[PDB]
Design an enzyme around this catalytic site. Structure first.
Site, PDB file in Angstrom:
ATOM      1  N   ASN A 176      -5.259   3.032   4.033  1.00  0.00           N
ATOM      2  CA  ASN A 176      -4.226   2.187   4.631  1.00  0.00           C
ATOM      3  C   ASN A 176      -4.786   1.104   5.536  1.00  0.00           C
ATOM      4  O   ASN A 176      -4.013   0.376   6.162  1.00  0.00           O
ATOM      5  CB  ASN A 176      -3.196   3.031   5.377  1.00  0.00           C
ATOM      6  N   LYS A 221      -5.214   6.718   7.629  1.00  0.00           N
ATOM      7  CA  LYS A 221      -6.214   7.170   6.673  1.00  0.00           C
ATOM      8  C   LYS A 221      -6.925   5.926   6.159  1.00  0.00           C
ATOM      9  O   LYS A 221      -6.380   4.834   6.254  1.00  0.00           O
ATOM     10  CB  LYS A 221      -5.573   7.952   5.519  1.00  0.00           C
ATOM     11  N   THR A 241      -0.623  12.707   5.118  1.00  0.00           N
ATOM     12  CA  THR A 241      -1.576  13.030   4.076  1.00  0.00           C
ATOM     13  C   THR A 241      -2.354  14.270   4.513  1.00  0.00           C
ATOM     14  O   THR A 241      -2.773  14.342   5.677  1.00  0.00           O
ATOM     15  CB  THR A 241      -2.493  11.793   3.852  1.00  0.00           C
ATOM     16  N   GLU A 295      -9.596  -1.907   0.608  1.00  0.00           N
ATOM     17  CA  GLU A 295      -9.419  -0.767   1.492  1.00  0.00           C
ATOM     18  C   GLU A 295     -10.723  -0.355   2.143  1.00  0.00           C
ATOM     19  O   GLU A 295     -11.784  -0.335   1.510  1.00  0.00           O
ATOM     20  CB  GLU A 295      -8.960   0.446   0.677  1.00  0.00           C
ATOM     21  N   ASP A 340       0.919  -0.294   5.070  1.00  0.00           N
ATOM     22  CA  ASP A 340       1.726   0.825   4.667  1.00  0.00           C
ATOM     23  C   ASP A 340       2.370   1.443   5.886  1.00  0.00           C
ATOM     24  O   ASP A 340       1.798   2.293   6.577  1.00  0.00           O
ATOM     25  CB  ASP A 340       0.969   1.826   3.828  1.00  0.00           C
ATOM     26  N   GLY A 391       2.511   4.284  -7.298  1.00  0.00           N
ATOM     27  CA  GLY A 391       2.822   5.622  -6.822  1.00  0.00           C
ATOM     28  C   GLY A 391       4.112   6.142  -7.415  1.00  0.00           C
ATOM     29  O   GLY A 391       4.610   5.613  -8.416  1.00  0.00           O
ATOM     30  N   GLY A 419       6.982   3.409  -5.941  1.00  0.00           N
ATOM     31  CA  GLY A 419       6.708   2.004  -5.731  1.00  0.00           C
ATOM     32  C   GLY A 419       5.337   1.595  -6.231  1.00  0.00           C
ATOM     33  O   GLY A 419       4.569   2.392  -6.777  1.00  0.00           O
ATOM     34  N   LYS A 460       5.074  -5.366  -2.172  1.00  0.00           N
ATOM     35  CA  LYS A 460       5.397  -3.965  -2.360  1.00  0.00           C
ATOM     36  C   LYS A 460       6.788  -3.879  -2.969  1.00  0.00           C
ATOM     37  O   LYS A 460       7.734  -4.477  -2.451  1.00  0.00           O
ATOM     38  CB  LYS A 460       5.339  -3.221  -1.022  1.00  0.00           C
ATOM     39  N   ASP A 518       0.581   7.649   9.279  1.00  0.00           N
ATOM     40  CA  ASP A 518      -0.122   7.663   8.011  1.00  0.00           C
ATOM     41  C   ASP A 518      -1.517   7.066   8.153  1.00  0.00           C
ATOM     42  O   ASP A 518      -2.013   6.402   7.237  1.00  0.00           O
ATOM     43  CB  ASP A 518       0.665   6.946   6.909  1.00  0.00           C
TER      44      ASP A 518
END
Ligand SMILES: COC(=O)[C@@H]([NH3+])Cc1ccccc1
EC number: 2.7.11.11
Length: 340
Positions: A161, A158, A191, A117, A174, A42, A45, A62, A156
């Site tokens: 994650n 979604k 998001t 994911e 995350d 990203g 990171g 991470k 966050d």
């Protein structure tokens, strides 16, 4: 609530607060690990699969570039992320195993979840059946009950994650936007498709935004697409604030009713934020088949087990350019990241 739940959450909070007040720091270093693969990347990171050279264990590391964190105004968020992750403990939260920093970067070394994911699995099958969506939703409900009882907002939620583990259960990853908040907070983050109206409208908002996001998630799991979908963010935001949602005819009536109550624009009317709190959700007819304790104890057989060959398999993640982990000869941004 049953005294059993009250006592569980009291202990959970005690244990969190002890770690919150005295965070762990500097528990490994980079040259303890071999790099295997980049799993995500990203603006400030990356996440890499690594292997510990002495134990042979695999981890998801991470890596955040301190200078880019500063430039993108993410300092406090990165400090939140690490301080929270080192202090929490719940079956559906990915475990932080080590953290450290060097002249250039911040590092969080977490359990590696090879199943990938939820997003990938959802897009490959199209949509989840209601039982399948409900199994994942129940885990998020319990996780948010835990987090909110510690005064934590996640911010966050979604499908990207939510990792699917070797038993088919969710691991939330995350914590970049997670924050300890008594009362209200104001930062624009999240998001677009998942933002609650009060975030879009720049209000002082609270944990009710997580319950809104759960409504979005459940809709997306069961439909295959999110409820406020549009081509550009501004069009998404107009739909979110409007108070209008359309449901596929294949949704059950119970699902539609639950979603209307999670997707209430007026946060004072939103399930999870009424006087009965999470119990309005847990007691809803859509959850009548859910054995909350059995889910917590991981005693329910999951909808599916991801296909993977072992703890080092990267097949459920996708391919990125491999870039250096460069460490400057000079310390960067030391003051900003003192507490990390
Ligand atoms: C559904 O429950 C709610 O929305 C609660 N805020 C109770 C309430 C309803 C109407 C008017 C005022 C207060």
């Amino acid at each position: 609530e049953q005294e059993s739940v009250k006592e569980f959450l009291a202990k959970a909070k005690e244990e969190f607060l002890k770690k919150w007040e005295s965070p762990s720091q500097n528990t490994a270093q980079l040259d303890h690990f071999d790099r295997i693969k980049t799993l995500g990347t990203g603006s400030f990171g990356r996440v890499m699969l690594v292997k510990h050279k002495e134990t042979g264990n695999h981890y998801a590391m991470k890596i955040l570039d301190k200078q880019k964190v500063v430039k993108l105004k993410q300092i406090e968020h990165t400090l939140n992320e690490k301080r929270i992750l080192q202090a929490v403990n719940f079956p559906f939260l990915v475990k932080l195993e080590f953290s450290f920093k060097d002249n250039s970067n911040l590092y969080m070394v977490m359990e590696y979840v090879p199943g990938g994911e939820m997003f990938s699995h959802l897009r490959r099958i199209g949509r989840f059946s209601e039982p399948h969506a409900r199994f994942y939703a129940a885990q998020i409900v319990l996780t948010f009950e835990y987090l909110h009882s510690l005064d934590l907002i996640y911010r966050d939620l979604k499908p990207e994650n939510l990792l699917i583990d070797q038993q088919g259960y969710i691991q939330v990853t995350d914590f970049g936007f997670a924050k300890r908040v008594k009362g209200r907070t104001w930062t624009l983050c999240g998001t677009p498709e998942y933002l609650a109206p009060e975030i879009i409208l720049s209000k002082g908002y609270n944990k009710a935004v997580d319950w809104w996001a759960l409504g979005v998630l459940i809709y997306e799991m069961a439909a295959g697409y999110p409820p406020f979908f549009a081509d550009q963010p501004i069009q998404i935001y107009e739909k979110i604030v409007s108070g209008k949602v359309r449901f596929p005819s294949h949704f059950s009536s119970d699902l539609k009713d639950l979603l209307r109550n999670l997707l209430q624009v007026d946060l004072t009317k939103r399930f999870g934020n009424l006087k009965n709190g999470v119990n309005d959700i847990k007691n809803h007819k859509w959850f009548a088949t859910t054995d909350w304790i059995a889910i917590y104890q991981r005693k329910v057989e999951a909808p599916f087990i991801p296909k993977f060959k072992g703890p080092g398999d990267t097949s459920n993640f996708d391919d990125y350019e491999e870039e250096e982990i460069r460490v400057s000869i000079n310390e960067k941004c030391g003051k900003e990241f003192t507490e990390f």
